[PDB]
């Protein structure tokens, strides 16, 4: 039914034998360029989406690339700082990714408050934005990171799924 090893699609010439062939991990392939590729990500376009007690601001992650991992080459998602955090540590969990420290403990004791912490203020937001996009362009552009499934959820699909598969971008 769904799983079938018999096929006569199109012009049938070869039959459903085994012969040899085999399907083994042949490492990374070639398509656009080396695993470095060209890469340009921008976290920005904030949305303060949350509750009066616990309101958070989401960031839109914009990316253009010809990376063989990124799949869509160039797309945009939107998720919150808390997802960046777990993305950071996830890359540090089982890989030696160049993951840098998150932007914080800086502008907070630098700016006013007003919006509880000041997160409702458009100055602070971009102050975290600038560093968060700095952060991401590394963790989302480094060999080890392109090798961690964490990037698949961050740059691709729609959102970071906190129940995803803890493995590499390349799957068997």
From Swiss-Prot:
<keyword id="KW-0007">Acetylation</keyword>
<feature type="modified residue" description="N-acetylalanine">
    <location>
        <position position="12"/>
    </location>
</feature>
<dbReference type="GO" id="GO:1905394">
    <property type="term" value="F:retromer complex binding"/>
</dbReference>
<feature type="binding site">
    <location>
        <position position="82"/>
    </location>
    <ligand>
        <name>a 1,2-diacyl-sn-glycero-3-phospho-(1D-myo-inositol-3-phosphate)</name>
    </ligand>
</feature>
<dbReference type="GO" id="GO:0042177">
    <property type="term" value="P:negative regulation of protein catabolic process"/>
</dbReference>
<comment type="subunit">
    <text>Interacts with VPS26A, VPS29 and VPS35; the interaction with VPS35 is direct. The association with the retromer CSC subcomplex subunits is proposed to represent a functional distinct retromer variant described as SNX3-retromer complex. Interacts with USP10 and SCNN1A. Interacts with TRFC. Interacts with SNX8; 2 molecules of SNX8 seems to associate with one molecule of SNX3. Interacts with PTPRU. Interacts with MON2 and DOP1B.</text>
</comment>
<dbReference type="GO" id="GO:0031901">
    <property type="term" value="C:early endosome membrane"/>
</dbReference>
<dbReference type="GO" id="GO:0070062">
    <property type="term" value="C:extracellular exosome"/>
</dbReference>
<dbReference type="GO" id="GO:0046597">
    <property type="term" value="P:host-mediated suppression of symbiont invasion"/>
</dbReference>
<protein>
    <recommendedName>
        <fullName>Sorting nexin-3</fullName>
    </recommendedName>
</protein>
<dbReference type="GO" id="GO:0051224">
    <property type="term" value="P:negative regulation of protein transport"/>
</dbReference>
<dbReference type="GO" id="GO:0050765">
    <property type="term" value="P:negative regulation of phagocytosis"/>
</dbReference>
<dbReference type="InterPro" id="IPR051074">
    <property type="entry name" value="Sorting_Nexin"/>
</dbReference>
<comment type="function">
    <text>Phosphoinositide-binding protein required for multivesicular body formation. Specifically binds phosphatidylinositol 3-phosphate (PtdIns(P3)). Can also bind phosphatidylinositol 4-phosphate (PtdIns(P4)), phosphatidylinositol 5-phosphate (PtdIns(P5)) and phosphatidylinositol 3,5-biphosphate (PtdIns(3,5)P2). Plays a role in protein transport between cellular compartments. Together with RAB7A facilitates endosome membrane association of the retromer cargo-selective subcomplex (CSC/VPS).</text>
</comment>
<keyword id="KW-0813">Transport</keyword>
<dbReference type="GO" id="GO:0010314">
    <property type="term" value="F:phosphatidylinositol-5-phosphate binding"/>
</dbReference>
<dbReference type="InterPro" id="IPR036871">
    <property type="entry name" value="PX_dom_sf"/>
</dbReference>
<dbReference type="GO" id="GO:0019903">
    <property type="term" value="F:protein phosphatase binding"/>
</dbReference>
<dbReference type="GO" id="GO:0032266">
    <property type="term" value="F:phosphatidylinositol-3-phosphate binding"/>
</dbReference>
<dbReference type="GO" id="GO:0010976">
    <property type="term" value="P:positive regulation of neuron projection development"/>
</dbReference>
<keyword id="KW-1017">Isopeptide bond</keyword>
<dbReference type="GO" id="GO:0015031">
    <property type="term" value="P:protein transport"/>
</dbReference>
<comment type="similarity">
    <text>Belongs to the sorting nexin family.</text>
</comment>
<dbReference type="GO" id="GO:2000642">
    <property type="term" value="P:negative regulation of early endosome to late endosome transport"/>
</dbReference>
<feature type="binding site">
    <location>
        <position position="105"/>
    </location>
    <ligand>
        <name>a 1,2-diacyl-sn-glycero-3-phospho-(1D-myo-inositol-3-phosphate)</name>
    </ligand>
</feature>
<dbReference type="GO" id="GO:0030904">
    <property type="term" value="C:retromer complex"/>
</dbReference>
<dbReference type="GO" id="GO:0005829">
    <property type="term" value="C:cytosol"/>
</dbReference>
<dbReference type="GO" id="GO:0034499">
    <property type="term" value="P:late endosome to Golgi transport"/>
</dbReference>
<keyword id="KW-0488">Methylation</keyword>
<keyword id="KW-0967">Endosome</keyword>
<feature type="domain" description="PX">
    <location>
        <begin position="37"/>
        <end position="161"/>
    </location>
</feature>
<keyword id="KW-0832">Ubl conjugation</keyword>
<feature type="binding site">
    <location>
        <position position="128"/>
    </location>
    <ligand>
        <name>a 1,2-diacyl-sn-glycero-3-phospho-(1D-myo-inositol-3-phosphate)</name>
    </ligand>
</feature>
<keyword id="KW-0968">Cytoplasmic vesicle</keyword>
<keyword id="KW-0446">Lipid-binding</keyword>
<dbReference type="GO" id="GO:0032009">
    <property type="term" value="C:early phagosome"/>
</dbReference>
<keyword id="KW-0653">Protein transport</keyword>
<feature type="modified residue" description="Phosphoserine">
    <location>
        <position position="82"/>
    </location>
</feature>
<dbReference type="Pfam" id="PF00787">
    <property type="entry name" value="PX"/>
</dbReference>
<dbReference type="GO" id="GO:0030111">
    <property type="term" value="P:regulation of Wnt signaling pathway"/>
</dbReference>
<dbReference type="GO" id="GO:0030136">
    <property type="term" value="C:clathrin-coated vesicle"/>
</dbReference>
<feature type="region of interest" description="Binds predominantly to PtdIns(P5) and weaker to PtdIns(P3) abd PtdIns(P4); involved in neurite outgrowth regulation">
    <location>
        <begin position="157"/>
        <end position="172"/>
    </location>
</feature>
């Amino acid at each position: 039914m769904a799983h079938h090893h018999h096929h006569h699609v199109g012009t049938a010439e070869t039959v459903a034998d085994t012969r040899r062939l085999i399907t083994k991990p042949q490492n990374l392939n070639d398509a656009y360029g080396p695993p470095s590729n060209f890469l340009e990500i921008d976290v920005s376009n904030p949305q303060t989406v949350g509750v009066g007690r616990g309101r958070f601001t989401t960031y839109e992650i914009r990316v253009k690339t010809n990376l063989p991992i990124f799949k869509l080459k160039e797309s945009t998602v939107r998720r919150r700082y808390s997802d960046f955090e777990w993305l950071r540590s996830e890359l540090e969990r089982e890989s030696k990714v160049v993951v840098p420290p998150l932007p914080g403990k800086a502008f907070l004791r630098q700016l006013p408050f007003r919006g509880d912490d000041g997160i409702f203020d458009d100055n602070f937001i971009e102050e975290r934005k600038q560093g968060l996009e700095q952060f991401i362009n590394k963790v989302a552009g480094h060999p080890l990171a392109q090798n961690e499934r964490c990037l698949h959820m961050f740059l691709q699909d729609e959102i970071i799924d906190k129940s995803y598969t803890p493995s590499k971008i390349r799957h068997a």
